[PDB]
Design a binder for these strands. Sequence first.
DNA 1: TCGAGAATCCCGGTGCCGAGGCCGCTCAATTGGTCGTAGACAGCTCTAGCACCGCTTAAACGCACGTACGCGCTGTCCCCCGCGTTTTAACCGCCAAGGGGATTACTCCCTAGTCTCCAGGCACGTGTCAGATATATACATCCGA
DNA 2: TCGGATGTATATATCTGACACGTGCCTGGAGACTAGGGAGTAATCCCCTTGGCGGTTAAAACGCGGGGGACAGCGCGTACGTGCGTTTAAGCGGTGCTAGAGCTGTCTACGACCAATTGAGCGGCCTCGGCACCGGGATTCTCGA
Lengths: 105, 97, 97, 78, 80, 95, 94
Amino acid sequence: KAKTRSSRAGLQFPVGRVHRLLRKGNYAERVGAGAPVYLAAVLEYLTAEILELAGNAARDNKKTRIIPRHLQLAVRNDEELNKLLGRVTIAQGGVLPNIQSVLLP
Amino acid sequence: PHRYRPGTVALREIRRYQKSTELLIRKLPFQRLVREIAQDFKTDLRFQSSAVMALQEASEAYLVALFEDTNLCAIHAKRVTIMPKDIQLARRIRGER
Amino acid sequence: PHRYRPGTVALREIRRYQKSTELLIRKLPFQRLVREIAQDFKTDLRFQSSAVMALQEASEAYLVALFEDTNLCAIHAKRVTIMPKDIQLARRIRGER
Amino acid sequence: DNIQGITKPAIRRLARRGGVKRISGLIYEETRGVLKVFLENVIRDAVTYTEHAKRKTVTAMDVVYALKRQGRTLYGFG
Amino acid sequence: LRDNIQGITKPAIRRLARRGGVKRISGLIYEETRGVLKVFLENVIRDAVTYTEHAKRKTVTAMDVVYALKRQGRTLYGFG
Amino acid sequence: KTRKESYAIYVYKVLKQVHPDTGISSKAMSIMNSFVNDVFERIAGEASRLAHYNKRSTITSREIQTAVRLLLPGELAKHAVSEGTKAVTCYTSAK
Amino acid sequence: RKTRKESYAIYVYKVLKQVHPDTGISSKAMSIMNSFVNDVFERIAGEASRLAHYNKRSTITSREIQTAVRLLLPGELAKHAVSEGTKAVTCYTS
DNA sequence: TCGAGAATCCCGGTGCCGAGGCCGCTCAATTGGTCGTAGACAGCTCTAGCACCGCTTAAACGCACGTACGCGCTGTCCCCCGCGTTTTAACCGCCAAGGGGATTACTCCCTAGTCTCCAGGCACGTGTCAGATATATACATCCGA
DNA sequence: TCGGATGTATATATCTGACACGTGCCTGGAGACTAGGGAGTAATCCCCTTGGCGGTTAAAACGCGGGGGACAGCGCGTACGTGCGTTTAAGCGGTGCTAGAGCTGTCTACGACCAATTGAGCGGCCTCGGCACCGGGATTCTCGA
């Protein structure tokens, strides 16, 4: 009989753990029923968008394994992800290749 | 006999250091600096290793972003060479001093 | 016959407007501006009066601080007259564009 | 339309309070663009708080909460 | 101890300036940069030691550094 | 010998859905774990302040939706609202 | 008949008549002082809550409030606020 | 160098509305007693932080040399400032209608709580292939005659 | 503009050690089921928002003359690059020790909870003086002689 809530909602992230972390961390006194389902759907979408952009850069540098340089390039080349992760330092990431034009010969 | 015109090795070092991802400060002098300026807050502290690595990551990222904004100030003044009043202008517009 | 040398009335208007505390924009045109650029988010909204007064306070304070940082950029470029590329430099160092 | 109601002498008075001696002639169009971007970003969040509270009236507390989310924190209006 | 601000040498500031994208550097940038770095490190170390004293410990862990930087307005991913 | 919970296997499953022929190292998995915890705490705190402003005592899916619209920028916010509404519909219809 | 509004007007007025015995205050300045007290309350309370969550506790004691004041106020102002709080707790117990 | 003159500043007189104090009535803080559990303390374990020693070589250091860049100086022209005249719409006072914001009352269904059961997820133990590190070499870009 | 000469991708081989997979167990999530309290829905009422008119006058708009600042070119000297040989200390590996972070077990003192009074604090209402405004005269800084 024991089905998980994630299989019922058709998701990959847990719903039971999100509900436990909402009830345990002092956000409000009651927590509803659709709140962990909505929040697990949102977190799954954001994770899928980041990893979809990162795997393409791992292809472009001809690799089969993602590293923080590839995560850095994927975040900083996108527009709205660069506004979401605006003041965030990613460890072992480096910078983008920018040279000003008046310095070039 | 063979010498490059001044500017060429500067440009290719710019490309070489923007291509890699590594730590650009030696780490035993940085560890001694951290322990020294932490000694004036609590005597006989005992750092881990990942704590010193996290501090070195954060400090390197801060200095690189400050140098980018300093370079934009120096280009705005119609120069190429960076001077310390550019650093002062950047840190005062940003909201730090 | 009597005319002041250009700069004098500018300096005493600087002193006169830094001495007072009032609203420096007319408020019926500002209210029409607020209702117009709020019309493209929800049709038939209904503002209070203190809401429009709060928006006018916040907008005036933002523009005054932007003009102070713009003036520092223009002095750094060894000029007196403020040009729009000074505004662009200020808003890009600050972290807005 | 109504962005031209932010006239040429009003921008000059705000610049005089900022401490500005001499002004060019393209600052007016640049400043109207800056003010329009700021007001769009604040009124969007104020209308979102109003739509969540099931109202049709934009109160002053919604403006204060939106400005506090931007990181600006106005004192004096509730 | 009096040194160790001198231990941040002067090819290292050069390498940081070239990752920043800088072509030609003056000769006073070195002391100015050493002052900037010492001020930043003092403000972070003070809050890390405050969290460590409140937890009633004697070691500064990585999470205390992460929490200090998060208070400064500078999030850091990869050490939590 | 003590347990510490994370989001490693779920990020691994999402990666095997989008790119079926790649892997991920340990450092990048640590970065993705930090990102998920960050965004979770940010959305949950915003929903809590909405529920406190409106003098109520319940965090519901409407609070989560308004917190998402306030927190994320435009196209990303529209796609997140669509995904969450589809999940809630498929959860209630499969009751 | 209206619904009551709790505020901090009378207490700010008490402190003003201790510190300047012949000075009044207008309405807008009292509103600014009310907003200031609410702001500082919410900053210190939020930081103490986050400390109690980091150390796996369920209780906000006065030690969390002391550490939050020490993290959040700058310098000599924190040095005097710690003294005022400790002195008031000591006078409260006895 | 001094006189004209155009804006600030100080003093007095009138008046009007908004702080400030008094009064009545609800409702939240106090007081007293009881219960269960969070945290303080004592004890054992075992694991990383600190200190030291020898070797190798990569990087920091000091020094000549030359050149490109910062910075002062000059001229000119053009565009922004100050001032006077005309127009226009903001501001104040007033009337009037009605939408919607608070408030109260009355159910009802949604979430917390409990208890039993079981399966998913975490710690630990293998194993092999993705990438880091050699050598050899096309070939691209810079500076000079 | 070709010629040489550094410097950088490009191909091929070999090892190592981290990522991916498999097992056991154990604790946290799911399944039923009951109580009661927050929230949804209707009705009222009255405040505060929106629209319109009319007279006043302060501010916006428009020319106009001219002077001061932006900008472009030129000269000079000096401060910072590029490259060479010498020194220094950073990195690596390995050994040893011990303080202190981490987990178990007992127990008690402290905070939640509940019921009954009662006084503090909020709304409402006069009411007088502090501040706002008008006017006049003194002062003082600016600019052309």
